[PDB]
Amino acid sequence: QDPIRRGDVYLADLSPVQGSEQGGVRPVVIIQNDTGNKYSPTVIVAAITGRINKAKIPTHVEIEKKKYKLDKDSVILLEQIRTLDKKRLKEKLTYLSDDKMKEVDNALMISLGLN
Amino acid sequence: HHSQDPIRRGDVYLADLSPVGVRPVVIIQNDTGNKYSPTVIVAAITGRINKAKIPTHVEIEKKKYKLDKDSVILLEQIRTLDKKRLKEKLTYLSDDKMKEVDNALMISLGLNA
């Protein structure tokens, strides 16, 4: 099937002991390199929150509800990063634009002190 | 007394990672967040292997870093942790070793040009 691609936006089961526990299925962005995304059992993701619609700290990237088929105008939290078993990935909502992915890269560099 | 010395990028802490624990981890988040944020970002350290197996791995030797055995930093295994989960500071990485972690983190996260 279609490879998980860096920059894709997925619904992901973040519920601890996920199975089908609660409403812990939230949008995330794939930030892992595409070689791991193709062969690894795991991916690395950044959280997306609708709790805010405006960047509050330098690790935030805003994303529009309409273009990216979200339930709210949201923010990518590059300070909230986690490695995820691929079995926790549900549906693929969309993918970020190349310009939007560049904002994510820059915020990732800030977040992890990579300059 | 809880040491007010600030958490720094490259520090090696013992951390409570349950659930998927207490294991060593490397702080990889920027030092401004490390000073003020409720959370840090860490990469896992494992003694299950003693040699880099994939390009996201960085080896660290037991004696230099006060480890129970030769270990590997897994830059494919990243997690954001509440600071409460950090226990004791074990040690911190050399400048060259940290440069290797940066490189493996750029590979892991697809940031290299």
Partner: nanobody
Framework: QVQLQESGGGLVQPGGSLRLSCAAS????????IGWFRQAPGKEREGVLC????????YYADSVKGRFTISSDNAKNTVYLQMNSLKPEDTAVYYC?????????????????WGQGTQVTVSS
């Protein structure tokens, strides 16, 4: 919704003290990020004392460390900026700001709520 209002500014002599209050016309500062800013004519607005999460650490501008501290009342509807050892460089309009997203740290790039500002003037 809410509307923040600063008070307690005014004129003080060098070395003097001043307590600014930031009162919330609607909410309590529970689980709210809180920032204190100042803006002097000709100068850029400057974050002076900012709290994101209570599980984080307070940010202080270098120039105010040791002199400015924050505290809140019992009702948690009032936060105070205690300003001691005031200097002529501290003259400015002072603003409080708050935001419901209390998962960050430092002075935020954006706050949902701002005050109108209160003037602080340190003159001899």
């Amino acid at each position: 919704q809410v509307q923040l209002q600063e008070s307690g500014g005014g004129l003080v002599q060098p070395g003097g003290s001043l307590r600014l209050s930031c009162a919330a016309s609607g909410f309590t500062f529970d689980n709210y990020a809180i920032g204190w800013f100042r803006q002097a004519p000709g100068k850029e607005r400057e974050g002076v004392l900012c709290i994101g999460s209570s599980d984080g650490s307070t940010y202080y501008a270098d120039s105010v460390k040791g002199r400015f501290t924050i505290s809140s009342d019992n009702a948690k509807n009032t936060v105070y900026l205690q300003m001691n050892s005031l200097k002529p460089e501290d003259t400015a309009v002072y603003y409080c700001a708050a935001d419901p997203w209390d998962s960050g740290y430092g002075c935020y790039l954006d706050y949902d709520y701002w005050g109108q500002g209160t003037q602080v003037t340190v003159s001899s």
